[PDB]
């Protein structure tokens, strides 16, 4: 039941109590994932107009 790192100031205080001791994607790859999804939206809307043209 020890108390360490007791630091005090005008607005309060803080300390630590020990009960027992122990025992990313770059900017190129994001633009590619976004443009890849847009390309699949453009392809889908294409098959939609192609079907509407038929």
């Amino acid at each position: 039941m020890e108390v360490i790192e007791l630091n005090k100031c005008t607005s309060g205080q803080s300390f630590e109590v020990i009960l027992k001791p122990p025992s990313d994607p770059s900017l190129e790859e994001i633009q590619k994932k976004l443009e890849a999804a847009e390309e699949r939206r453009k392809y889908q809307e294409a098959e939609l107009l192609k079907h509407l043209a038929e």
Binding site: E45, L48, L49, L52
Partner: protein, 423 residues
Amino acid sequence: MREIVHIQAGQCGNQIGAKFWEVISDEHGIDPTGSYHGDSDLQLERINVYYNEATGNKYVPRAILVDLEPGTMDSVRSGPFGQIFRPDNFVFGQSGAGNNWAKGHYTEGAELVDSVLDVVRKESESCDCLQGFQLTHSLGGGTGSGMGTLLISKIREEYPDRIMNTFSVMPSPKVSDTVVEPYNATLSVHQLVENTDETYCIDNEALYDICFRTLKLTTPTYGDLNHLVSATMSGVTTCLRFPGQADLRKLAVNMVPFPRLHFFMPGFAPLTSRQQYRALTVPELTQQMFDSKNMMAACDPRHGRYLTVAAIFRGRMSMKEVDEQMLNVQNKNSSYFVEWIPNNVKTAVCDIPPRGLKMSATFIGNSTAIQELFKRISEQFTAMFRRKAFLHWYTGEGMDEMEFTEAESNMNDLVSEYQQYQD
């Protein structure tokens, strides 16, 4: 500013669209001249969703009236709220459609479609942000069915990423105009399966039984049947027209688990007969609203299973008491709801009740029981198409028997699709 473009096509389309505007115009405080005389700011809050603001504080319904003969639209323009509609928005022919899908879709309608679209593009080019389109029409006639679905096919081409909403009146031999209504309905159902996001199915047979049995009306008219459609269209559009925590797309994202299964069964409550003054409790609203005798699909839900359900409660009531009763119907009949979609039943409260009602409730069900509807239509279809009866009305307009066989197969698939998801 999320605006909705309204389109009403054909006899049935316009007569229903008419009352729908009469009903909501009342709730929003709009008189037959487009002037506001309400008492609450809730009315004008989401007003621009269905109305355009002209000069002098005028509210002009954002609606397009379409028909191939003047008859029906002449009545609207002379009806009660007829003056409210924009004069240009009246687009009509003269030859008529002869209750022929072929004429509405390929010949007569094709001559007028490009002009109705020129008005559609006009109302959209003013919308700050267009939610989508809603169409009112029947499927058994010639214009709203044959031409209406032709409009949808074309609106989806010019606005491929906007919501296409419809109120579709299904034909019923018990309320039949002509024997070819199954032909027309089977053809339009395929267009709706492919090109609409949401279709509120409205079986005229259901409306008849409701006016005859529950409402105790000796001889029903198309006028009595439209009173219901008004009350029902007003309810389902409450989420859109009043402040509440909902746009067209959000509704589809939360209701349509699969593309082709987007036909709903609406339901209303109360349905009292003139004992009309008895105050109606929240339990009673709920026990009726789920009762099959209060639905407009003529389908026994106990024969199918619900995929998603929405319910809107209108009036000054206990939101804690609403929750307790909705959560009760679910837990007492969980055998009729699919277990693979969590929380597939939602509830929304509204403080503004319909005209002449202390509190009401509207029901939006995406039930697999709706296959019984497409089953009747597909039965009445085959009974005639196996002998080629009345085909000449259509092959004379340019169609072929192959296109009929394909629409037949197109809907039988729709039935099998609703079947595999019922097990």
